[PDB]
Amino acid sequence: FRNQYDNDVTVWSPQGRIHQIEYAMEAVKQGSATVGLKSKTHAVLVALKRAQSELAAHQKKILHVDNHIGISIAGLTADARLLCNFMRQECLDSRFVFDRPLPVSRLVSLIGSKTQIPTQRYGRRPYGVGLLIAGYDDMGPHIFQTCPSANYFDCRAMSIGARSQSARTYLERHMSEFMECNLNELVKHGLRALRETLPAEQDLTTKNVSIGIVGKDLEFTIYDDDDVSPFLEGLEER
């Protein structure tokens, strides 16, 4: 009994509720699992590449943004690539003007505003992609996750995408011991978190995991295929 109200984003349901935003959430549940835990010194983004095509190189979840900011996308590729361009523009302008790396906690607010603007005007759709922002600045690592609802959260660990509730449960069960970890153990925890989403019949191969790390002295470096062998090896069986 709400078919008239769930078509345009500028129409409140007679329950105090915008159905279009809630439908924009449902795009995030169509990507693929990706995990963004952090430690006291570093922040990592473990993502699972899409094995939906075959014989064709998988999509590119982790995206370089700046020397100290990296993102992981779990939504519409169009909106993801449209937001990453804006992010790059903001960081470039910040380094051009103030000659300082743009702090993560302000770039995220800029994202929030820019993604809120379409949520209110007619003839537009909310940005149907959820981000995972790993960054380092004067206050150490940060992990911010963005929703299509123009609502950004500050997270010590989060997973978004298909079946990400399993990863969230696992991280919630192991959040305490994340602050004190060397890079190896942090990446192993993230790999395990991504692993608890997959069906038990498949394991994390080197062709579908895309670790990307930033921290104190390490720039945001994306580790693609076989190069992720050092991180992935030593991972115990379930």
């Binding site: 078919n3 449902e26 014989l55 064709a56 998988h58 519409l76 537009r124």
Partner: protein, 241 residues
Amino acid sequence: MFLTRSEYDRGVNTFSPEGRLFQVEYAIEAIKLGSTAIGIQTSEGVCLAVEKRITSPLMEPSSIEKIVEIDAHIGCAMSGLIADAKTLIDKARVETQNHWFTYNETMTVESVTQAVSNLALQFGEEDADPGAMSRPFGVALLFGGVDEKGPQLFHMDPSGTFVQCDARAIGSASEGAQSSLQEVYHKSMTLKEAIKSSLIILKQVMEEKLNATNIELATVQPGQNFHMFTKEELEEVIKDI
């Protein structure tokens, strides 16, 4: 208790439950009508074959424009509303030349397909008045070329997405062709046997006889730049079926 009509595939910028733009993935439904195209990317080079589907003998085969030259080192294959392909290819050519002009170098294939995708994904922003699409494109493209990273092939469909694919078939029989491909495809393919196998699959998925006029294919390898195959070489490579 009650069943109701519930239309979310009509207007663009509308998210159905399960969160998917029906409107765009209807434009994906449009590729299902265009001609079948095959692109095989071997270490020795990459070839692009495509059926032409001439309707009447009175039609000039050379007029049907299914494989174009984006530049000397990028070839492209069309499938779908070629009316859209004509503006996408124009964008690709203009971008390649702009990049060469600004940067005295040859534009890599990945960046070409990235720019062409940038032309897409501007589906609905009619607040931005000047000359928008107001719709997704209706064409799926196969950018083949050679660059610093060796020969590469890219597939892009009306969703602004690309992959460094190889052995991706697009067209009406795209999935049947792909099913043949993965079990025929191999890493170490000489360009000859790549063309061979591609034409065999294109055979089984055809309507008409296979001859020099029914299809036409091109190859690019580090040796020479973009190269079409003529009536001569088409007969020359189909002697052996």
